[PDB]
Design a protein around this nucleic acid. Structure first.
Lengths: 465, 281, 51
RNA sequence: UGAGGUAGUAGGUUGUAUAGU
DNA sequence: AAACTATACAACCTACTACCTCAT
């Protein structure tokens, strides 16, 4: 009885000023907008890690294909898709001895085991970056199977997180060093054998997709922008607010809100929030004290001024929970009178499974549902005709947007969200369920709330994923 | 054409009856024990039926009189017109959805079907032997895979602010013999993830429709005995919509590619999966 | 604005700190890696702000 | 990457140990 | 200096927000 209005797929800008829907296929067609001249890879690990990383990179030099590449497109080779060169030569390596590994591993406490391993890795990165006459732009540490399976918190035979890469990145924030974490099981599925025999990380049919993801992550961390967005109106900032909960022992952790800002470029000019003991989790509705609200808004405004040399005529605010009215009263007292405030709440737990009456494929991605002029249902999950398969399993679930306060066209915020949800960098996929500013929200909150020693972190995005 | 998982209200009952028993309600009495849904709103008992049907267990109700039992029109409740300092509109809607949740739970518990415990809700299933020939509307509902017996399930929780509808969340329950449930919830989750690749969305819709038709009693509704005289009718027909544009249907090979993509999600992430596989034998 | 200060030492301090935190801001937000930063100081700054 | 599983709070119910006039 | 019957937070009765798990 009621229609499902569809929103067209926004095309991402590519090389030579052209646009295509799929990032993989079009990136194989055109390439990156601004080519880099190449980067040096610093692998930190063992000799086995050395040989397996060199073998994997030599494997991804030559073109490799997936099982069917309508869904997971081809990988023509790193030089054949990015332009910048990558070879096994001129690769810097740092020795990780078993003696330190064994001396650390023989301790029973797993948390201090994580502590000493991250301390060793950070110290070796520091002594590789502070005295070596050579230059490394990207680091690729390798964790073997035994370290990953023995550092689990609940494996049975306080100021830091139990997991590795979160606090590695958190302690590596201050020195402005980009790096990537690679599991041994990820790139060595050939010899990674379980009890049965099959690879646990069975990347055999999608080694092209694995090469796609790794190469895109490396080119992102290199410094060259892989892609940008197609259509952006002048004077809009997508401020996706984070409210990742922090559990630093028994001190008042409360709220540690953060944000990612999209003004005119794909990268998120992320500014750290406060440690922030206010708003006792009895009132754990994750609102904002006015002074931090104007602090964050002024931070975004001066970021827009320093990166665009003008004033933003419109503000987008994204979150998961609802918004109050006093925080917006504090917001509007500092905004210019020509601005516009929009607060959109994104939820997933709402149960709504539009089953298909007849056919062989479910509801596609992009078919939105309008309830009111302020709230709507958007399907960023499911079938897409370009990839010719769904991105979900069983039946996908949509996202429910809701403009809390502020007047706006629901179609405008729908198109803005659909344009935002196609910039996943660490994973090379056509689209995801949640938007990118919310997909990266958990990562940025985890990184910025893992080490309290960080005060003013680097506001470029390359040091996080 | 697409059909959703919503089930709207066919005809909302007219009277919302509040029973101000005040001192006639025992303090230690458990409100959940009543055969009809109710709440202790202030000194009132917000019910849906008459006052004199609780005499089987409450030997003080017979002294209560009719005219102190106020009634509220639900048209103004659903339209938001209801404006009284006793109850405002939104918490009235909240108590309404609480009442219909309890009423559905008790009605469907009265039909003698089994129950499994979830975290913040409950999911339900038909035990073996109750359904003859293991078929309903030419749709399989409860079957056997490997050695574990799988039972399809639903979970219902209402919400009315766009329209008086009721959602249903599809679940699947597992057991080893068709008698007693699995002791560990993680084994149930593992079997759910194992059986996820076995079928797909069309079978999900078929099982959901079969469950909805099985829990119904009449043809185009279900019979919620919310009161001794007043019942609630749920549109067992799911709410259906359509899109102006859609795809072209491919062959069955891309369903295998969707199962392949499930295996890609198997390959891309893994988190302490080794203990539950190695130490299970 | 910085020229008309009385003692050139505080002018040197504020200009040096301005260049420093400009460089820090530039390399802490810009995604494009910069291997070498080229500080093009003006001649009159090197001449009129001598110790 | 989406569906199940545990701690417990959105916002109004009624049990503890005082104090307003 | 002390009569009636309320307060002062404040624990707790059904359901709504986030972190960690298991597995394709």
């Amino acid at each position: 009885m009621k229609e499902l209005i569809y929103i067209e797929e926004p095309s991402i800008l590519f090389a030579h000023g052209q646009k295509c829907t799929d990032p993989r296929d079009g990136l194989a067609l055109f390439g990156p907008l601004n080519q880099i001249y190449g980067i040096k890879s610093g692998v930190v690990g063992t000799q086995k890690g050395l040989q397996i990383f060199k073998s994997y990179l030599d494997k991804i030099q030559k073109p490799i294909y997936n099982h069917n590449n309508i869904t997971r497109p081809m990988f023509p080779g790193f030089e054949a898709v990015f332009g910048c060169k990558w070879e096994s030569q001129n690769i810097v390596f740092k020795e990780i001895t078993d003696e330190e590994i064994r001396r650390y591993l023989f301790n029973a406490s797993t948390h201090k085991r994580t502590y000493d391993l991250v301390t060793l890795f950070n110290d070796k990165i520091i002594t590789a970056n502070k005295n070596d006459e050579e230059r490394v732009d990207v680091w690729f540490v390798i964790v073997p199977e035994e370290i990953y399976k023995y550092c689990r918190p609940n494996s049975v035979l306080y100021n830091y997180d139990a997991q590795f890469h979160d606090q590695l990145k958190a302690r590596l924030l201050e020195h402005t060093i980009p790096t990537q974490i690679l599991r041994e099981s990820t790139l060595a599925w050939r010899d990674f054998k379980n009890t049965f025999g099959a690879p646990i990380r069975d990347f055999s049919k999608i080694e092209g997709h694995l090469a796609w993801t790794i190469s895109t992550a490396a080119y992102y961390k290199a410094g060259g922008k892989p892609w940008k967005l197609g259509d952006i109106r002048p004077g809009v900032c997508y401020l996706g607010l984070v409210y990742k909960k922090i559990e630093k022992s028994k001190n008042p952790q409360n709220a540690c809100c953060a944000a990612q800002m999209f003004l005119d470029n794909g990268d998120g000019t992320v500014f750290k929030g406060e440690v922030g003991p206010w708003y006792n989790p009895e009132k754990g509705e994750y609102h904002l004290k006015p002074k931090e609200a104007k602090a964050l808004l002024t931070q975004a405004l001066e970021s827009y001024k320093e990166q665009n040399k003008s004033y933003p005529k419109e503000v987008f605010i994204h979150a998961r929970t609802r918004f109050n009215d006093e925080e917006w009263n504090a917001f509007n007292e500092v905004t210019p009178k020509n601005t516009n405030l929009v607060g959109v709440t994104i939820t997933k737990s709402k149960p709504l499974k539009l089953y298909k009456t007849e056919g062989a494929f479910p509801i596609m991605r992009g078919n939105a549902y309008i309830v009111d002029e302020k709230k709507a249902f958007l399907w960023t999950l499911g079938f897409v005709p370009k990839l010719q398969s769904t991105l979900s399993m069983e039946v996908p679930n949509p996202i429910f947007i809701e403009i809390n306060k502020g007047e706006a066209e629901i179609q405008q915020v729908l198109k803005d969200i659909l344009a935002l949800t196609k910039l996943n960098y660490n994973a090379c996929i056509y689209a995801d369920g949640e938007p990118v500013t919310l997909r990266f929200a958990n990562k940025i909150g985890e990184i910025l709330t893992a080490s309290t020693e960080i005060k003013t972190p680097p506001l470029a995005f390359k040091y996080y994923i | 054409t697409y059909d959703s998982n919503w089930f709207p209200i066919i005809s909302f009952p007219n009277e919302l009856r509040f029973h101000r028993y005040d001192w006639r309600l025992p303090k230690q009495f458990d409100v959940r024990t009543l055969a009809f849904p109710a709440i202790r709103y202030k000194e009132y008992l917000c019910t849906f039926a008459w006052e004199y049907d609780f005499i089987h267990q409450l030997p003080k109700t017979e002294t209560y009189n009719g005219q102190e039992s106020i009634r509220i029109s639900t048209s103004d409740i659903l339209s938001g017109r209801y404006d009284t300092d006793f109850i405002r509109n939104y918490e009235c809607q909240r108590l309404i959805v609480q009442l219909i949740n309890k009423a559905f739970e008790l009605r469907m518990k009265d039909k003698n079907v089994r129950e499994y415990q979830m975290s913040k809700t409950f999911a339900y299933w038909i035990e073996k032997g109750k359904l003859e020939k293991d078929k309903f509307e030419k749709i399989k509902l409860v079957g056997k895979q490997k050695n574990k017996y799988w039972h399809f399930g639903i979970s219902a929780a209402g919400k009315l602010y766009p329209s008086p509808v009721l959602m249903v969340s599809s679940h699947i329950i597992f057991t080893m013999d068709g008698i007693n449930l699995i002791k560990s919830k993680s084994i149930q989750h593992s079997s759910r993830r194992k059986q996820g690749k076995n079928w797909w969305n069309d079978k999900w819709r078929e099982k959901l429709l079969a469950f909805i038709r099985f829990l119904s009693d009449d043809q185009n509704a279900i019979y919620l005995n919310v009161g001794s005289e007043e019942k609630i009718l749920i549109s067992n027909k799911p709410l259906k919509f359509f899109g102006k544009m859609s795809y072209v249907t491919p062959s069955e090979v891309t369903l295998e590619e969707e199962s392949v993509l499930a295996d890609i999600n198997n390959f891309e992430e893994d988190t302490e999966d080794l203990d539950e596989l190695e130490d299970i034998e």
